[model samples]
Target chain A: YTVHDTDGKPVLNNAGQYYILPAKQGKGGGLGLSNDDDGNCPLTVSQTPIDLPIGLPVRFSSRARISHITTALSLNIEFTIAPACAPKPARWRIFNEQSSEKGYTPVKISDDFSSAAPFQIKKFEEDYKLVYCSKSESGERKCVDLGIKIDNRRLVLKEGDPFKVKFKKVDE
Target chain B: YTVHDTDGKPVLNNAGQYYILPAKQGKGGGLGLSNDDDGNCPLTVSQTPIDLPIGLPVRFSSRARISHITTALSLNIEFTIAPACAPKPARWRIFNEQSSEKGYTPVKISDDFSSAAPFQIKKFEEDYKLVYCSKSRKCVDLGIKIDDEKNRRLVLKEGDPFKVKFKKVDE
Candidate 1:
C-alpha cells in the first residue's frame, strides 16, 4: 500500500523508512501513524484496512437518528481567465500642412485645382498627408496620393494643433 | 424627407454651400448636386414625394402582390457572434515543503493526494508567485523561494506561495 499525507497526493519515502505500522493497526485500530506534513518528519507509515470507526453509524448501534461520518474524501477546484485587449476605431485627419501659410483652413480651388479632385486625408501617426479617393468610370472606389503643389512648394502638411491652412486665391 | 448616401449614414450640411443648382429638381427635374465620397459635396435635399409611376396592382388590378405597394421602406442585415474565443485553461501548483523533498509530490492525505493541496500559480507580468487552493485547508500546500542554492540551499520550501486563498472547499 502507498503512503500519503493528508492532501491526497502520494508521499515520498525513498529511504524505505515509511512502512506499514502494525502496532497502530494491532487489534482493530487506533489513530494512524503521524503523516509527515512539511516533509520534515521521520515517516508516515500506511496502516490501511484497519477498522476503528469515528462517528458511530446507525447500523453499528441499537437505535440511532443522526449517524456520524467522522471522515470522508473531498475535492478541490478553481478557474481563471487570460488578460488581453482588442483593436478599436483608429481614424484621424490633417490638423494642416507645412509652409508659410498655415491654419485649419478648408481647401479651395486656389489651394490646388483638385480641391476641385476633392482631396482626402488620412492620419498615420502624428502627421497627416493628402490622398486621392477617386472612383473609376465603372463606379469603383479608388485611392492614391497624387502630390499636389502650391506656390513654389509641393503642399505637404505638417504637425499643427490649432491647425489651420491658408488657401488665398493666387491671382497675383 | 431626407437624403442618405450609399451607406445609410445620414448626409451632413455645414458650410451652407453644398446646395445643388436650381437644376435637377428644376422645371420639375434635372441636375441637382455634386455628391462626393469624403462628404465634401454639393447637396442632395430630401425629395419626400414627387412625380413618378410604378406598376398597378390587381386590387389596383387583380388582387395579388400587386394589391398596391402604396408605400414601403426597408433594410436587410445579418451578424454573427462577432466570433469569440473561450478562456484558456489556468493551472498552478504548490511546491513541497517536505524534508528530502522531490518535486511533484502528491499529498493524498486520506485517499489519493493529488493533494497535496493541488496548488495553482499565476503571473501578472514580470512578477510570478504561488498561492494555495484555500478551501481544503492544506497549509497552503506550502510554496518557496531561495536564490539558486542547490545542495546548500534547496530553495526548497519557499516562503508560502503568494496565493490568494479561496474558501470554496467543495472537494
Candidate 2:
C-alpha cells in the first residue's frame, strides 16, 4: 500500500528527502535531529525555524523493496553524523528509560538497522499517526502511541494522544 | 543482441572490467590501451602479457540503456586520462586520415559518443566479428592494420573481419 501525502499523492522515497510534518495547520516544525553529549543524536520535533526534517523509508526485506511504503518501514535521517563524534553511523532506534521518567522513550540514533526498530504508519481519520507496535522481549506485543513532551527544549516521546502527522516531499 | 563469450555465456557490464580477446586464441594479448605522444591513447592489440584490457559497452540512446549489449554499442575504456594530457575525457572513436598514411583509419579515443561511431557485432559462423556500419557510411569490417612500426592498431578495412570474443572478469 502506498503512503499518501496531505495532497493524497503517493510518497516517494527519493533518497531520504521527505519531511514528516504536523497534519493539522498549527505551530512547531517537523521531525529534526539534534546532538547529545555522548556522541549520539536524538530525533526530535523541531519548532525552530532553522531546522529541516529529511528522511527516507527503507523496507525490511531486500526482495520486497519498492519506492512506496507498504505497512512497515525503517525510517532513516538523511543527515550524516561526523565520524569523530561517533564510532558507528547513525540510524533511528528507541532509547528506553532506565532511572527516572519511567514512562518516557525518546528516539535516538543507532549503529545499524539491527538495533533500530521498525515503525508503522496507519491511517487516523484525515491523516496518519506514527505507531510502535513491535514484539517485546517476552514475546508479547507492545503497541505504543508516540507523542511529544518537552525535554531540554526538545520534543521527546510519551504515551498520550496520537501525534497526527503527514509526509511532505522535498523538491529536488 | 546480447554479446556472448567463447563459452556462450552472456557478457556482463560490470563497470567495464571485461577483456575483448580473440575467439580462437593462439598468441598475443587482448585489446589494450596505449598512450600516444599527442596525449591521445589508441586501442591496440597488446602482445605484452602485462596489459589488462578493461572496457564497457554504452548505448547511443539514454532510454535504451542496459547492462547487456544490444545491436549497437559505443565501446569505452575504463582508464582515466590525465587532465593535463587532454582537456576532455576519452572515449573510443575512429580517427579519419589527415595527411600521411592514406586509407589508414585507426581507432582512437574521442571526447564523447557524438564523435564516436557505433560498432556492430555480427555472428561469423561459431564466433563473432566487429563491423563498423553506421548511417551514411558503407559497411566495413574492423581488420588488423599493421603499420610500418608493426603496431597492430584496429582500423576499418576490407577483406576478413577480426574475429573476437568477450571474457568477463570479476573485480
Candidate 3:
C-alpha cells in the first residue's frame, strides 16, 4: 500500500520534499541531519528551529535491488543531495559493520541504490512506522524497527517500537 | 501597516480564520481561547492539538474606534462570535478594572468596540509584535503571563512581548 501523510495524502515522488515528524508528541521532533564526531552527516530526529523547516528531497527510483520488487520498500529510495554536501550522494544506506561499535547501525548518505537501504512505511494505528528488515544474501532475514537512539538522537536500526511518523509536504 | 503572515502575505479582511502563531517557538502555540474556570472564555497562547488547528475568525470593523486607524491594529479588532460561544460578542476588550486584582489586565471578548481595546502591529527585528499602548488613552504591548493554572494569558504588562505571525487559513 502507498504511504499516506497525516493529511491523508499519498506520498508520491511528484510531491517533492517532505518532513517526517513523529506521529506522537514527546518523541522529539522532525527528521533532520546532524554532523557526527567524524564530521559525516547522519539523519537524526529533533525539534525544528525554523518555521518552514527544510525537508529531505526524496525520490523513488525504478531500479530494483531485491528479487521480489514489491511494495515501496522494494523500490529504490533515492534522495537528491544538495550542493552544500558535495562529494556525497543522497541515497540512504545503513552503516552495518562501520557503526557496529555503537551497537546500533545508523542511516547515512550512500552513493547509489546498490548500497542503499530498503525502508518501508508500515500502516500504524493513525500514522506510519519506519522499518528496515531485508533478507540477507545468505537467506537470513533480520527485520528491525527504525528508532532514535536517545543518546545522540541518531536514527538507528534497533529492536523497539517502530518510529511512528507522519509526512508533511513542503509547500514550494 | 498591514499585519503579515509568516509567508509574508498581508493579513486581509476577506481572508478566512487565521491562527496567530508565536513568531518564535517556546513562547507557546498559536493564539486560541480557553475557559478561565469561571466558565468565561479569554484569549490564550498554547499549543494546538489537532492536525488542522482551529484559528480565530478575525475581522476589521468599518467604523473606526481610534482617531488614527491607519494601521491594522488601530482599526476595531472584530472577531466573529461562533455559535458555540453565543451571547458573547466577537469584539475584544481589555479587562482593565475587572482584572486589576490579578496585577496585569487580561484581554477578553467584549460586546462592541465601545469597550474594545485598540491594538497595533509593530515591526520588531524580522517579525512583528502585538502592542496595545496608544496615546494617554495610550496602550501597552501585549505580553504573555502564566496564570495560577499555568495557562498563558494575554495581558497588558511589561514582560515578554508576544511576537506573532498571522497565518491565514484555507477555506
Candidate 4:
C-alpha cells in the first residue's frame, strides 16, 4: 500500500497538517499540523507522505480543486520521494472534480522535476514533508484544504502503517 | 529701208499677210503678215538676221484693243536670231487705245523671262499674236488671236514706233 499527501508526495507519521509559521517563528520554519478541527483552518502549505516497505508495489492517490472565481488561480503540484521509498519516478494523476467519472488520469510535472532533490528520511523516524505553495492576486498565500472523509471518519495515517490516504484542509 | 515680211522680221520684201505661229510651231513655220484694210489683220511672228549679232538689243512697241468686245488682249513679243528662231529676251511694251494711255509698261527680257528661246531670221520674227495671257495671268506659251487694223496691230523696229504696253479688258 502507498500513503500520499494531497499533492501526491509520500509522507511519514508525525508530520502534522499544513500551517503557516508566523514571521517571528523565523524563516525556513513553518507552523506544525494541529489536531484542531475548528472551521478556522490555519492557512499553510499542503504536505503529503507515503509509506513503502522494500519490494512492496504500492500507489498513492490524492486530489485537489482549483477554486473558480473571477480571477484565475494558478496551481502547481510536485511529487517527491523519501529515501526509504523506491527511486522509481513517481506518477501523478489529476482530474476535474466536475468531471470525476473520469478515472485518475496522469499529469505532467514541469520539465524541472527531475533536477529536484529527493526528500531524505532519517533513521530517527523522521518524516518527509512535501510542501505545496499557492498564491493569488490578493497578495495572500492560501492553502487548498481538502475536506475528505473515509467511512465518515477523518482519515489520519499512523507510523509504519502499510499505506494511508486522507483529505487534509489547508487555510488561506 | 527695212523691208521684210509683215511678221516684223527683216524680210527680202515678201509682200503678203501672214499668220502667227502658235508657240509650238518649229523653225520658220508660221503665217505671213496681212495687208488687209478691212480691219481684219493677219497674225505673224517676226525675226531678225542672225548675222547681225548675238545679244543685239531691240525695242518693240505697239497699241492694241479688243474689237466687238470690251475684252483686253494679251500680247507677247520676243526677239530672236536665225535657224530655229527660239524667242530671245527683248524690251517690249503695250498700250490701250481707248484710253490712249500706256496700258502695260515695257518690261525687259532676261533669264527670268519664261518665253525666251531660239529661232531663224526667216523663222525668227515678231509674234503679234493676240495673247489670251494676262499681265496678271502672264504665260510663256498661250495667247489670244487678234485681228489687224481694228483689233490689234504690230510695229516693227521702225514702223509705228510707240512705246509698248500690255492690257487686260475690264468688263
Error of 4 at A139 (Å): 99
The candidates, ranked best first by DockQ, are 1, 2, 3, 4
Each prediction's Cα lDDT score?
0.20, 0.47, 0.52, 0.23
True-vs-predicted CA distance for residue A128, candidate 4, Å: 99
Query: Which of 1 and 3 is the better model by lDDT?
Result: 3
For B19-87, candidate 3 gives per-residue lDDT tens digits of 666665433345555333323223332222111122345554424443322345554454553223323
TM-scores for all candidates: the values are 0.16, 0.39, 0.43, 0.14
Order candidates by TM-score, high to low.
3, 2, 1, 4
Off by over 4 Å in 2: A13-16, A36-63, A72-89, A97-103, A115-117, A152-156, B1-171
Question: Which structure is stronger by DockQ: 2 or 4?
Answer: 2
- TM-score of model 3 relative to the true fold? 0.43
Model 2 residue A164 CA deviation in Å: 1.1
The prediction achieving the highest TM-score against the true structure is 3
Q: How far is candidate 1 from the true structure (C-alpha RMSD, Å)?
A: 40.2
DockQ of each: 0.01, 0.01, 0.01, 0.00
Residue range A1-172, candidate 2, lDDT tens digits:
5678656766654243456676765445566655543344344333333243333222122112576664455333323423334213344445441112323566554332121234567677777777654433233344566665554224344557667778776542
User: In model 1, which regions exceed 4 Å deviation?
Assistant: A1-119, A149-151, A154-172, B1-31, B34-171
Clash pairs, candidate 3, are: B132-B139, B132-B140, B133-B139, B133-B140, B134-B138, B134-B139, B135-B138
RMSD of each: 40.2, 18.9, 18.5, 64.0
Give candidate 3 regions above 4 Å deviation.
A1-172, B40-55, B62-73, B81-83, B86-88, B98-102, B113-117, B133-136
For each prediction in turn, the share of the native Cα contacts (below 8 Å between chains A and B) that it retains comes to 0.00, 0.00, 0.00, 0.00
